[PDB]
Amino acid sequence: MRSYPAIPRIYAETTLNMLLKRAKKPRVHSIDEYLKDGGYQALEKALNMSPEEIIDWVDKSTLRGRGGAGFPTGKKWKFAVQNPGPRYFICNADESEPGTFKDRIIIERDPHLLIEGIIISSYAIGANEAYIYIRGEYPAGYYILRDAIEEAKKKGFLGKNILGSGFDLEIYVARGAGAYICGEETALIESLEGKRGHPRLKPPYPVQKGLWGKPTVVNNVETIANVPFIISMGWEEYRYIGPSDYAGPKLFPVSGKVKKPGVYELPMNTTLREVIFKYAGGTLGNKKVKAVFSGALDCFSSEELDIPMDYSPLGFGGTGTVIVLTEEDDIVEAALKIAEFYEHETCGQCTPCRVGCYEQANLLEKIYKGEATEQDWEGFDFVNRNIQPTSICGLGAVAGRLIRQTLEKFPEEWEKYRK
Amino acid sequence: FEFPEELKTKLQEHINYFPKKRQAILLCLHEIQNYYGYIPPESLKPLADMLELPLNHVEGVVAFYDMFDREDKAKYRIRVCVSIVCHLMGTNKLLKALENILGIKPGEVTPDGKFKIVPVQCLGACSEAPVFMVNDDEYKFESEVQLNEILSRYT
Amino acid sequence: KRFRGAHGHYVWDGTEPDSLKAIEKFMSYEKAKSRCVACYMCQTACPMPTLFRIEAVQLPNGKKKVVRFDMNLLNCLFCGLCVDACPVGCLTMTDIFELANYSRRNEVLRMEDLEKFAIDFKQRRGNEPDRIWPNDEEREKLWGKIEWSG
Amino acid sequence: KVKIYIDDVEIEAEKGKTVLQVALENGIDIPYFCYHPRLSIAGACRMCVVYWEDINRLVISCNLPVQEGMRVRTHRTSEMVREQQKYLLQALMTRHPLDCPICDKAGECDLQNLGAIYGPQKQIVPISALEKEREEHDWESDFLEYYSNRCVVCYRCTRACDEVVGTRALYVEDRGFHSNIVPAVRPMDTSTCEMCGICVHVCPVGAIISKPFKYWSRSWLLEKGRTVCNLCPVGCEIQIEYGVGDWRSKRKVYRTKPTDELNICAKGFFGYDSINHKRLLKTKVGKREETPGNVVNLLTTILTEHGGKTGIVFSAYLPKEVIDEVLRIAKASQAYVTAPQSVDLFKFLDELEEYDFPTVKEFEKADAFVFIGDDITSVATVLSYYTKKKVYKIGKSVRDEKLQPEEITYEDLQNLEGNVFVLVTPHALNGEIKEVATKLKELKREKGFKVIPVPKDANALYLYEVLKGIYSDLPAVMEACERGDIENLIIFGEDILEFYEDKVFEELKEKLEHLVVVSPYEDGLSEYAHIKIPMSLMGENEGTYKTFFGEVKGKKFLPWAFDDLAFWKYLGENFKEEKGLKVVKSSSNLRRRFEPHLYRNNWITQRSQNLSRLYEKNKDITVYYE
Numbered sequence A: 001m002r003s004y005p006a007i008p009r010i011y012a013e014t015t016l017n018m019l020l021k022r023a024k025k026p027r028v029h030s031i032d033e034y035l036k037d038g039g040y041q042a043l044e045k046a047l048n049m050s051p052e053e054i055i056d057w058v059d060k061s062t063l064r065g066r067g068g069a070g071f072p073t074g075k076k077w078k079f080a081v082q083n084p085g086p087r088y089f090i091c092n093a094d095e096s097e098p099g100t101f102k103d104r105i106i107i108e109r110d111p112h113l114l115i116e117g118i119i120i121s122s123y124a125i126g127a128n129e130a131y132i133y134i135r136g137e138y139p140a141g142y143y144i145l146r147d148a149i150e151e152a153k154k155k156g157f158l159g160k161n162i163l164g165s166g167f168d169l170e171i172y173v174a175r176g177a178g179a180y181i182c183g184e185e186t187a188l189i190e191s192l193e194g195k196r197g198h199p200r201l202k203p204p205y206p207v208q209k210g211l212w213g214k215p216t217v218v219n220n221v222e223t224i225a226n227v228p229f230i231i232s233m234g235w236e237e238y239r240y241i242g243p244s245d246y247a248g249p250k251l252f253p254v255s256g257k258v259k260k261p262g263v264y265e266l267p268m269n270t271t272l273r274e275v276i277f278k279y280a281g282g283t284l285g286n287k288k289v290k291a292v293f294s295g296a297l298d299c300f301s302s303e304e305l306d307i308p309m310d311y312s313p314l315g316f317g318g319t320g321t322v323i324v325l326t327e328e329d330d331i332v333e334a335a336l337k338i339a340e341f342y343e344h345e346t347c348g349q350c351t352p353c354r355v356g357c358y359e360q361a362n363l364l365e366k367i368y369k370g371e372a373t374e375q376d377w378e379g380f381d382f383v384n385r386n387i388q389p390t391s392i393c394g395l396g397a398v399a400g401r402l403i404r405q406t407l408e409k410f411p412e413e414w415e416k417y418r419k
Numbered sequence B: 001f002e003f004p005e006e007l008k009t010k011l012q013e014h015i016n017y018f019p020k021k022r023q024a025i026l027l028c029l030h031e032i033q034n035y036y037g038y039i040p041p042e043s044l045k046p047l048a049d050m051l052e053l054p055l056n057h058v059e060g061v062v063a064f065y066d067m068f069d070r071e072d073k074a075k076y077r078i079r080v081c082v083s084i085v086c087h088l089m090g091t092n093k094l095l096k097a098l099e100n101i102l103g104i105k106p107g108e109v110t111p112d113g114k115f116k117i118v119p120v121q122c123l124g125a126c127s128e129a130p131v132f133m134v135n136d137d138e139y140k141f142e143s144e145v146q147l148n149e150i151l152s153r154y155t
Numbered sequence C: 001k002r003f004r005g006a007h008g009h010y011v012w013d014g015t016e017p018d019s020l021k022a023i024e025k026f027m028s029y030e031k032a033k034s035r036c037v038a039c040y041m042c043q044t045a046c047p048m049p050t051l052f053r054i055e056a057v058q059l060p061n062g063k064k065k066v067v068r069f070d071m072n073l074l075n076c077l078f079c080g081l082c083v084d085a086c087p088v089g090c091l092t093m094t095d096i097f098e099l100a101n102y103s104r105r106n107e108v109l110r111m112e113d114l115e116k117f118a119i120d121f122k123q124r125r126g127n128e129p130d131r132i133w134p135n136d137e138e139r140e141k142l143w144g145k146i147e148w149s150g
Numbered sequence D: 001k002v003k004i005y006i007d008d009v010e011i012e013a014e015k016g017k018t019v020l021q022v023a024l025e026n027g028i029d030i031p032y033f034c035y036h037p038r039l040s041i042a043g044a045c046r047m048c049v050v051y052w053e054d055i056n057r058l059v060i061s062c063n064l065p066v067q068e069g070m071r072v073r074t075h076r077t078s079e080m081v082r083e084q085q086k087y088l089l090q091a092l093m094t095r096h097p098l099d100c101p102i103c104d105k106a107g108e109c110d111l112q113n114l115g116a117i118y119g120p121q122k123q124i125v126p127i128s129a130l131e132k133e134r135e136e137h138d139w140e141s142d143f144l145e146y147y148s149n150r151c152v153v154c155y156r157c158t159r160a161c162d163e164v165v166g167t168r169a170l171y172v173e174d175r176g177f178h179s180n181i182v183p184a185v186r187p188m189d190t191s192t193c194e195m196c197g198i199c200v201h202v203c204p205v206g207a208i209i210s211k212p213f214k215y216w217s218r219s220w221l222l223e224k225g226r227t228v229c230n231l232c233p234v235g236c237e238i239q240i241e242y243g244v245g246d247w248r249s250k251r252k253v254y255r256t257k258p259t260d261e262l263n264i265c266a267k268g269f270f271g272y273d274s275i276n277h278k279r280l281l282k283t284k285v286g287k288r289e290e291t292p293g294n295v296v297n298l299l300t301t302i303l304t305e306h307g308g309k310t311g312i313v314f315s316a317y318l319p320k321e322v323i324d325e326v327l328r329i330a331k332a333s334q335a336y337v338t339a340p341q342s343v344d345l346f347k348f349l350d351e352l353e354e355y356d357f358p359t360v361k362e363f364e365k366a367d368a369f370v371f372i373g374d375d376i377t378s379v380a381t382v383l384s385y386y387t388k389k390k391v392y393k394i395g396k397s398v399r400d401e402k403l404q405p406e407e408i409t410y411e412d413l414q415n416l417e418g419n420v421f422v423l424v425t426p427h428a429l430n431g432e433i434k435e436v437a438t439k440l441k442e443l444k445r446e447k448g449f450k451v452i453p454v455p456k457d458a459n460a461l462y463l464y465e466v467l468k469g470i471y472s473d474l475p476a477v478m479e480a481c482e483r484g485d486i487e488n489l490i491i492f493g494e495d496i497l498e499f500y501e502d503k504v505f506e507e508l509k510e511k512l513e514h515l516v517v518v519s520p521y522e523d524g525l526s527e528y529a530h531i532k533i534p535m536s537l538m539g540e541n542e543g544t545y546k547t548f549f550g551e552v553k554g555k556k557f558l559p560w561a562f563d564d565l566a567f568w569k570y571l572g573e574n575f576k577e578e579k580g581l582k583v584v585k586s587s588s589n590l591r592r593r594f595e596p597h598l599y600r601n602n603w604i605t606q607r608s609q610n611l612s613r614l615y616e617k618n619k620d621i622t623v624y625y626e
């Protein structure tokens, strides 16, 4: 289509002008504008390099995955080319964690930056078939990607013998249908095979046996958008962006009680306090910050605002999601929304999570309504602390993480709910 | 039960697009649901035949994903985000407005079958909370009057 | 109140425990009739199972109906193990003890009898509290006025 | 081949096995739900957690292959494992109802057993017994009932339906806490489901219930025995659960179960009631019970003085030992011997001249399968659980469609290549018996295919081995009765009713001097007899059968059993020297009166009240897949 569905005007700001160079403006940037802006030249440079060199530059760039696990991209690619092909490359555009809207502004505004990164990466691991798995609730992004891919094929960037390099590639776009678990590497692959989204037991890992049991690489949209910059700038040049260890630009979706909610492109040495007050404009009504929710994973209190937004132990971590809560917001009520979220997304494959998430949310609901008894409390604790040990995947492993942290950082607020 | 030509062609495009037919199952279920306003249980066998898949496989898939609806028929699904950020910014105000305009609560569908309110998890537009969708279009809730003008554009 | 007398079958009167009400949907019962669901826990727990005789059927509507429940008190230990095993609050020991009779046959309780015993026991001492003895005048002959306390 | 440690105890384990397998083999009980030795590994219940010291992490043992020198710890020496067992069992019990008093699984329930041994011992998550709900849908079946709140979603049923039976009749309805099992097509009783009861048996709890068994008893009040199922030629080993007539349970068969090999079909699972139906358990003369010794004298007189005018109609539902004794007596009486299988099976095997009869285990060696004749899944059902290679077909195809068979022609067989197993059902060749046998005989010599005859009756192949060259044609025997050449008939079972209608025997009772019927039932063909002699059913005799699972020997444990073999052997004490035989042959073509069906394949399953309901619903259906 040439007229896409309606999407909100998400505000975007940047201090590096790399990933949001074009995405800072709320509109589609088609191939003609992207080319005038220098697009696809990084792909031609990469195609004049061997696949092994490209993997090497990505490893030396020290780029880590922006999907939440922080695994080093270059090493993931090296693991995949350890086994014989055919190989597959998958772009993970599921993006369904609460407060995370960073990937959509790239897809909806600069799809060619993502397409170029997919091509370079596919060439690097020797994948002639690449997939983009985008959540079902992103219809504009779906049509936009489909059309941008068609523009690329017309210009010769996709298809057979790309730019005379002998390299063949086709990018298929898959749509989800409402499941946060499909963002999990193996569940996505299962969904891509036309099955229910249940995560697989690992080992094996997808880099050895993934889509159709063949070596598959799954990378987050943000991670891939970095690949064109790594080739274009050179790996050495890229590594100097930000702190020595956590290099590269990073997208931060800031939401909640802030004046300027939106996506911010900043270096990972920035502190959470700088993110909220320096870039997002402070809090609404200038109310005091009570807590910050790293998506549905972590909970930071007002006493932890001076930490770096990196992948270090004492750092923010996660995917950079910043949900700001002020002094008039109820933590218990907030935890309930989190509990309801995990109950709604547990896939149901394994016991600790299938039942833990449901009973955790039901118990917290009784606590919140004031109908909780002493055994209800003891039971709430028991469940919250035992969902993770035997869970199969990351969902069950963190379904009680944030709620537990609010119990330790805001005990006074929780005891206000005891009879 | 047979698929009308218009819908059958769309389904064939998806089935021929992917390298393997079964990979088109989610796009086909979307196509069916957008055509009939719901996924008629009577279409799973015809779809499973086009994909060369056993019926129980197709049934298991359509049962797993949240967007698919085999019970209620609605021309427009009003997906309302009830997750943390939108809840903090006014999801309740939006639901109350939807009730004042259409007389329905989450999960219900108007008598003529025009609208159905569907509560959903984070829609990925938290910076523009409260968010809601009208089948494919995403909007920010501003006021009851504003919501009424937006809803008047459908039917 | 804790006397282990003649057995009885508590009846469907509205004061049933959560466990029985939870399975009521599966039973074919009548108001003011035995609560028994024929689980065989009493007889299985009993060291003398031969004294029991329980029978239940599956009605054509799918519900379960108890059709026979007999106990021979002359081979009973009056031990109370069966009441412990009743998961539905049906089997109980009443205060009935004047059962001497002229034939082994008069010492065999049928379901109809178990119901009548329990109905009468509940009718006369259901709200009575769990005390060491229920009447002090009958005990005064031997003990006298006892200085009770809270 | 590999040494490991479980709670610091050295244990030798064959490489390729899992820690859970090794532990169970060595008597180390580790609680588990979703692992089943016959199904693929699932790793979903997580109840089999063990602490793997080598990696300092909790791991599921059902998926942990043994490695040289590995060290694991179970709940015996690990509190971490103990805490997770209590949590997992408590989680399962959260919405599990207080249904034990009326649930059919009580006493043999994995949740009830494990929950009492490793569970929380008290309620930690306080849920009222009145709020024990989970999403649920009626299976719309008269035989199976699903209780989703009792379900501990373990996926054993789904795996068994897809990997063992292959019918693909179940699916998991909407995800998460409320994941519930639903039949792919409802009403279930006429869907692709073959009502084999395997889902009932693999279910670790009372989630999937057998309606015929509901509320009639309690699992711990029944007796148990294992024997050979003789309802078809496969030879499955099944377990009969029965009562004796004491305080625990009535003197009858209450239900039946497969073993952990999951070798069972609907006939074997729901046909148990044919054992209780109108049994003939005493020798009778007319309508009056008579002592066996007196009946033995009558028969001794009949065969000694009138053997040359006596015909014996064998049943393929007789064990080898009885067949042999009767045949030996016949050869001592100069009688006529036949079997209804002489109409089709014997004519075919006579032309084929040499066949193959490998065990089910040997089916692994085949590259492809060719089904010729009837619907194999309706004749020897369990065989369809082992024909997992390419399947070609010539003939009727109804339930066999689950194997996605490719239709071919006899001319195409010449081009197949490599270790082909041809499974042919002679009762379905209608006039092309000799032609088909001749064609397969060429194929067996030129290309070397395996030609395996699939009889529809349990011991028909042994009957053929022992009767070849000397059997009379069934129509010739009947024709000889009308002519008066045969004055006495000893008929075993009702196999004969597949070719002649009842009226024929009502008239034969008048025409014959002696009509002796050897049957397990007081109704049917035995109603027309002058002398009725009991015939044993499964679990009532120690007889061997030549089946697809080998030469299997049954066990005698049902207490009301009539000693079939002892009676015949006693009669045989009056016959020592071999006198001869008489053979009658005739070209008249007898047509089978009815086609076997998955739920009714012989006169025994016909007397099953359960299978009769299933048969009446599906008798007209001919298409289940498309």
Ligand SMILES: Cc1cc2nc3c(=O)[nH]c(=O)nc-3n(C[C@H](O)[C@H](O)[C@H](O)COP(=O)(O)O)c2cc1C
Binding pocket: A064, A065, A066, A067, A068, A069, A070, A071, A073, A092, A093, A094, A095, A096, A097, A180, A181, A182, A183, A184, A185, A186, A218, A219, A220, A221, A223, A224, A393, A394, A395
């Ligand atoms: C419950 C769950 C949800 C996830 N969701 C996403 C997601 O929405 N987007 C994403 O890129 N990765 C998601 N992941 C992480 C993927 O498993 C995987 O680690 C990542 O996509 C790999 O790409 P990367 O190396 O570039 O980070 C999720 C993981 C879990 C356990």
Ligand code: SF4
Binding pocket: A181, A198, A199, A345, A346, A347, A348, A349, A350, A351, A353, A354, A391, A392, A393, A394, A395, A396, A397
């Ligand atoms: S932990 Fe939760 S999401 Fe992960 S497999 Fe288990 S049930 Fe599914």
Ligand code: SF4
Binding pocket: C035, C036, C037, C038, C039, C040, C041, C042, C043, C054, C085, C086, C087, C088, C089, C090, C091, D101
């Ligand atoms: S234990 Fe109770 S419910 Fe069970 S059979 Fe005995 S009296 Fe009836």
Ligand code: SF4
Binding pocket: C042, C045, C046, C047, C048, C049, C051, C075, C076, C077, C078, C079, C080, C081, C082, C083
């Ligand atoms: S009182 Fe003791 S001996 Fe008598 S029936 Fe009960 S359990 Fe058996």
Ligand code: SF4
Binding pocket: D096, D097, D098, D099, D100, D103, D104, D105, D106, D107, D109, D110, D111, D112, D150, D205, D206, D207
């Ligand atoms: S499934 Fe087991 S634990 Fe649940 S009610 Fe039945 S017997 Fe009891």
Ligand code: SF4
Binding pocket: D157, D160, D161, D165, D167, D168, D169, D170, D192, D193, D194, D195, D196, D197, D198, D199, D200
């Ligand atoms: S009983 Fe057997 S055939 Fe029927 S649904 Fe269960 S596994 Fe499938």
Ligand code: SF4
Binding pocket: D150, D151, D152, D153, D154, D155, D156, D157, D158, D181, D202, D203, D204, D205, D207, D208
């Ligand atoms: S019905 Fe039984 S076998 Fe099937 S998932 Fe539930 S507990 Fe497991």
Ligand code: SF4
Binding pocket: D229, D230, D231, D232, D233, D234, D235, D236, D263, D264, D265, D266, D267, D268, D269, D380, D381, D382, D383
């Ligand atoms: S396949 Fe034959 S032997 Fe096996 S259970 Fe069924 S009827 Fe019996």
Ligand code: FES
Binding pocket: A098, A099, A100, B081, B082, B083, B084, B085, B086, B087, B121, B122, B123, B124, B125, B126, B129, B131
């Ligand atoms: S929370 Fe409503 S859109 Fe993310």
Ligand code: FES
Binding pocket: D032, D033, D034, D035, D042, D043, D044, D045, D046, D047, D048, D049, D060, D061, D062, D063
């Ligand atoms: S038995 Fe190992 S996970 Fe279920």
